[PDB]
């Protein structure tokens, strides 16, 4: 019986065999007062404490978000869905400890993405109990306010000042800070991990000065704040708050009294109308997100990217190999997860205004022209790989390339990784190749879990893959030293060193991508 | 491996098993089949076409260096034996160029792209194509070893081709 | 020592560790050790570094060796805390009794009970902290004899004795390598065989007796101090390496083991400077040298001997590999020792 | 000054020695010594330095001479706090009157009680902490007069006369 004193009270855990061993979960521990009432859409406020014992032997609920009803039954889609009820009282965080207690161990904070409008800590491919079985770290994850909920701006105003989720991230890592010694963890070794909007948010925690003190070093997977879908400008922040207001008949004069308005609607009402905050939107939409609000972020961030305003440490991040391929089943014609979506020309060219809404028709050429050129025009699925190169190319690759160039330039260690192993169990079609979210597991261990139908090739991958994230996270180098493993060099900008990730040989390349992000960087911003 | 090292010590062979054969993993039933090839692709020409290159541009002069990975569509002999030897002479002589003979689009393109490179070597003393964006093949160095790789999809530079096979051969192989 | 010796007129910010095999092994993983890092300043090699095959043991094995001595003493459990009541039991002689059997195979460099990675004195598996570079960044001083595997050949190679001059024969030597080499594939100890026994040349008797010290030298101690002070000194601080080649005039063992293991720390602690003692006159002299290279180490970093015209150590580096030799003649400036077998031991045995 | 300059106007943070022939000789040594590494910042050495032949006594000479000087005003003693006890009790000219002859041959250059390794003020030859870098790390300015030597010889070369212009022969030379 697990019993651990915290700041805030005491709390109980539970004991977990894995791979004949034991691992300690605390599962929903809470980490802030509940936001509701007058608490919704403000800063998460101080946990006030409790005597008697909380139980951490469940996960908590998850935050309010809509969910995908795409594919009803399908496990490709679904296992994303959240998996514990809903509610607006859903401040809480896990912690998974080895047993027997570590003495002072490294910490793995993991960041869930979803787009900033959906996910929650509790997915089965974010169960942190391997990592923590075989690495003997600790891994913490946190719940935080995602959508209007969460992101909500009226700028300046702290009835709605923005960045909310942000700030419940920030106080899970404060939680961290001064209790995760009496767990056995060291506060000193901390690394904030994440896939997609929770790498965004990494890399913004980077920016923040707020966070700047409780964490030491970065993994940013599949995702980074200039990602074009990462930050809401002030100007589309007001208009989508406001057209919110009206939506829900809120519009007011007082603003304090458009938010005191809003913080009467029900849960459902709010969500409900999300989507239409906005005229156009597109599967890559995210409604409510990042803003710059003086707070949490100072300015806009491509200016402090720049400038080399951000915190000094090294960065690990990578990409996967068909990141723009999920999203395409979502909307754009002629495409399937049901069958091999052969589209045309014509299709691809309606493909671009589903993906790039507004717009110009020369930007729109622009992309087709970069993208259609082939050698040779004689294969059917040409246009298809094409539209999924421009999604994964715009949207993830180039930008999280470009990061981690400016990141470099500015004197640390980053290193990169370009993930391209397909798994044996991906229940989406193979035209849809290795897709957005399917390294999570990887990285995460599931795969050693024998028990489980992934290949031989697919445990061994897995373990090097967690033990090069378990020394970047101990010792700022993501080297695995023991199997003769190929080395990882660090990525520079000059030669642009990365490493592949496979189940055959992992390799040492230069410069992915260097002619699309050509493209998306210097020419794209300009239409 | 007692056919091909007849004369061949005992512990010569071991060694070469020992080399060849510890995977990731013991799984895959071509495992075998495959390695077999390696030892003796490696060993009668790829490490020692790599190390005359290191040798020769340890002394000054400018060596490319290209990694042949494309199967001819056309190619008789089956699928298990791969980028055989021999089978780049056709590309190299432009075979695939005559539309008539049912090679493939991509095949007529490397093709094109082969007989340029190859013909601007020996005009210009190095080999790129300068016209169609073609990725550009460094010169062959004794530190990072640059290869370009030909395929009918894209071409790349890689590094150290057979670098831990060689390492074999080259270095304890001779000793044995 | 930190809490009490300025009391005794020490400076508790001027400490050296100083160790001599299992000793300097000691030391090594003080080097890596977080409980160490502000115990001390810096830090001496002798014959022995973590990296040692013998010096850390699994925690396989570890388990193993602590089940297999519960039973010994009959006090297998099903509690663990049960079986270490029980062992707290025991009179001391009857554990030192079946500490020699905790093991099937075992040789004359057994270490049955080691350091452990325990995730308190040791986190990791220390070769990862050591390419990794993560220990107390100081100046270290590493050496190693001149025949250091010779002491373990009369403990159960067949053929060596040190009363007689043990020229073995070539079955003997393999059979050597059965008593060094447990288990230790065939291969394994064919390339062995192969890496140490072709000459130049197949004429000289001690051919054989001479090669099997080697196997035990290079693999046991100088390869694993070599790569110790490389992989140390490539994360930025000054190493220096020695090479130490006297053989006392004193030894008791006979002239074929050479400068063997241990045989250095007479001159280290400075026996030799009392002349009442029968060390030659070129003793006392490299004594007083070594005395006070070791005495600029600990309160410089540097260990020159500065008046009295000497040859300059220079710092090892991975690159040049350079190490001074020490014996009663010249000392000299060499490079790269052991070369050839290091690559041997370091690069391919890890393998087989 | 460290304590009570600042009252006077001065600033303890910027504290320069300077000092000539022994002068000189002392800074450099205060720039060895531990004791003063953080009383000034920095030094100046004017004809004069602690390696200079006549700036430090060894030990052996030292208790030789410590003892000579005992023997010479009866004070030679077999406890050594006894031997300094009487010594304290001679009169200033006594002492004063006995140090030219401490020591047997002496010079011009005669320095018969100077520094020593003592332990305290200074901790190892300081030829050694030199070469070894162990002295304090801040700027140095030193020089020396273009004809320091001349002033040494009219006390007692034959030949010098500060009252003639002292054309000596190769045979005073030799016995200078
Ligand atoms: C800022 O918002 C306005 C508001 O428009 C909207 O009203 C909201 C409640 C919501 O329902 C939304 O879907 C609806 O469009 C946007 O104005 C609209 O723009 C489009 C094309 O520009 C027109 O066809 C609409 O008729 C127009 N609506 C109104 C009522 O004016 C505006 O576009 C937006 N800014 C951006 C850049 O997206
Ligand atoms: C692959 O499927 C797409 C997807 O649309 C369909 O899913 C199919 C399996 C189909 O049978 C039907 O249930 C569903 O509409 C097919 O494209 C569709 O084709 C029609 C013309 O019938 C369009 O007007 C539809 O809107 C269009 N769907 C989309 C997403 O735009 C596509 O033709 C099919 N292609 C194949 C088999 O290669
Ligand atoms: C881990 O220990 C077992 C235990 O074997 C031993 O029992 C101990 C009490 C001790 O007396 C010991 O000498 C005895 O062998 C080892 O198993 C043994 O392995 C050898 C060869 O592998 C066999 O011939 C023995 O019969 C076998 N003994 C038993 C009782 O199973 C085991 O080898 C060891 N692990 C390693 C890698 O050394
Ligand atoms: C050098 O001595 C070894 C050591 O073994 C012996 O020590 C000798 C001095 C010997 O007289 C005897 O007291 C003791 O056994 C000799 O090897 C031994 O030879 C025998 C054959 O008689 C083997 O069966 C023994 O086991 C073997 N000993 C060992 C250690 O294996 C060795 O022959 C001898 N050689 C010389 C004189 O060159
Ligand atoms: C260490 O001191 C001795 C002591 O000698 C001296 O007695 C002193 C009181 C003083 O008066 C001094 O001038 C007198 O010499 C030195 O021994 C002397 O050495 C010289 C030549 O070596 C001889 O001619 C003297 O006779 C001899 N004197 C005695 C009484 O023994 C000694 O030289 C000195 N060490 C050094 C290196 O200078
Ligand atoms: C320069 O003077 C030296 C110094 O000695 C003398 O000082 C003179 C001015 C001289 O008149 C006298 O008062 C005093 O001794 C002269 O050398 C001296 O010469 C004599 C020979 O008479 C030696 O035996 C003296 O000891 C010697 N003195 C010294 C210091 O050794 C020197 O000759 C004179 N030379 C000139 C004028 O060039
Ligand atoms: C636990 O270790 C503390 C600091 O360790 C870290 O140093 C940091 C700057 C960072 O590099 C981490 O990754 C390092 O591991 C130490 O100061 C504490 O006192 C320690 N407490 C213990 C051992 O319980
Ligand atoms: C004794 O010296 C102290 C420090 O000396 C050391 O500086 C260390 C960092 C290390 O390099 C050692 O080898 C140096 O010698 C000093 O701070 C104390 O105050 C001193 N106390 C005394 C003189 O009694
Ligand atoms: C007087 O100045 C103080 C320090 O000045 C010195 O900085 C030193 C490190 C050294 O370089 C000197 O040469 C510099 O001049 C300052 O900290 C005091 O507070 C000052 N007090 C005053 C102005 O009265
Ligand atoms: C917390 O859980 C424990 C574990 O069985 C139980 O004993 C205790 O009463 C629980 N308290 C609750 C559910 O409030
Ligand atoms: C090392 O490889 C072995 C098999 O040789 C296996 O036990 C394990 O997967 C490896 N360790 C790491 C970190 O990959
Ligand atoms: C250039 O590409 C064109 C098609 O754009 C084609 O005519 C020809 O194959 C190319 N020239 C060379 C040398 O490859
Ligand atoms: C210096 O050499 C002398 C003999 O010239 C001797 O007194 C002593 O052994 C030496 N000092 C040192 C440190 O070796
Ligand atoms: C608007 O009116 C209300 C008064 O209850 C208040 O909450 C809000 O701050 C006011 N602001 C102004 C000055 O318009
Ligand atoms: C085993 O039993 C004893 C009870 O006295 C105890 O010392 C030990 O911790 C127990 N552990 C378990 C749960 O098996
Ligand atoms: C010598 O005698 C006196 C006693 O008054 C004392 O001052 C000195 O320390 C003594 N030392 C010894 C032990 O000879
Ligand atoms: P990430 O959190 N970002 C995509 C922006 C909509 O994953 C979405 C599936
Ligand atoms: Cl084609
Ligand atoms: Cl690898
Ligand atoms: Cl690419
Ligand atoms: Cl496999
Ligand atoms: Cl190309
Ligand atoms: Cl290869
Ligand atoms: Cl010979
Ligand atoms: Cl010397
Ligand atoms: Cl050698
Ligand atoms: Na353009
Ligand atoms: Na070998």
Redesign the interface.
């Known amino acids: 019986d697990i019993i651990i004193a915290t700041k805030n009270g005491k709390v109980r855990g539970m004991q977990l065999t894995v791979f004949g061993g034991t691992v300690t979960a605390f599962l929903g521990i809470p980490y802030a007062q509940p936001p509701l009432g007058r608490l919704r859409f403000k800063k998460p406020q101080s946990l006030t404490k409790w005597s008697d014992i909380w139980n951490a032997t469940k996960y908590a609920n998850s935050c309010c978000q809509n969910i995908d009803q795409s594919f009803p039954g399908f496990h490709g889609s679904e296992m994303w869905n959240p998996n514990t009820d809903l509610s607006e009282d859903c401040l809480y965080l896990n912690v998974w400890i080895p047993a ?1 207690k ?3 161990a490294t910490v793995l904070i993991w960041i869930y993405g979803g787009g900033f409008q959906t996910g929650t800590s509790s997915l089965h491919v974010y169960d942190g109990k391997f990592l923590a079985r075989v690495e ?1 770290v600790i891994v913490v994850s946190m719940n935080y306010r995602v959508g209007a909920l969460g992101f909500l701006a009226l700028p300046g105003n702290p009835e709605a000042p923005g960045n909310m989720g942000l700030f419940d991230q920030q106080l899970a890592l404060q939680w961290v800070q001064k209790n995760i010694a009496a767990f056995g963890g060291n506060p000193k070794s901390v690394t904030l991990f994440g896939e997609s909007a929770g790498a965004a948010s990494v890399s913004l925690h980077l920016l923040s000065p707020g966070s700047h003190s409780l964490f030491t070093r970065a993994i940013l997977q599949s995702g980074s704040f200039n990602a074009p879908w990462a930050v809401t400008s002030l100007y589309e922040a007001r208009n989508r708050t406001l057209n919110l207001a009206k939506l829900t008949g809120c519009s007011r004069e007082n603003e304090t009294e458009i938010i005191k308005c809003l913080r009467n609607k029900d849960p459902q009402e709010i969500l409900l109308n999300e989507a239409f905050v906005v005229p156009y939107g597109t599967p890559l939409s995210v409604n409510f997100g990042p803003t710059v609000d003086g707070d949490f972020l100072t300015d806009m961030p491509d200016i402090l990217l720049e400038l080399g305003q951000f915190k000094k440490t090294q960065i690990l991040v990578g990409v996967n190999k068909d990141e723009g391929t999920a999203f395409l089943v979502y909307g754009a014609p002629g495409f399937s997860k049901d069958n091999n979506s052969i589209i045309t020309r014509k299709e691809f060219q309606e493909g671009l205004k589903i993906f790039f809404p507004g717009v110009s028709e020369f930007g729109k050429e622009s992309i087709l022209f970069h993208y259609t050129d082939w ?4 294969r059917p699925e040409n246009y298809r790989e094409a539209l999924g190169d421009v999604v994964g190319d715009y949207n993830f690759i180039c930008p999280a390339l470009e990061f981690t160039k400016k990141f470099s330039e500015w004197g640390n260690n980053a290193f990169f990784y370009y993930f391209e192993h397909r798994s044996s169990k991906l229940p989406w079609p193979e035209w849809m190749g290795v897709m957005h979210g399917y390294e999570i597991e990887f990285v995460f261990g599931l795969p050693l879990e024998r028990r489980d139908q992934y ?3 697919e445990e ?1 991958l897995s373990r090097s893959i967690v033990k090069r994230w378990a ?1 970047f996270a ?2 700022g ?1 993501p ?1 695995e ?2 199997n ?1 493993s190929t080395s990882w060099p660090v990525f520079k900008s000059t030669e642009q060193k990365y490493l592949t990730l496979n189940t055959e040989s992992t ?4 410069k992915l991508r260097a ?1 699309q992000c050509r493209f998306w960087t210097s020419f794209f911003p300009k239409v």
Not at 375 to 378: A, S, T
Not at 507 to 510: C, V
Request: aromatic share 4%; proline share 8%.
């Open positions: 027997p570590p003495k002072n003997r050698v040779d025009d004689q290949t031989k090739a061994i020394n101990k010792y180098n080297q030293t023991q003769n390799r040492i390349m230069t002619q």
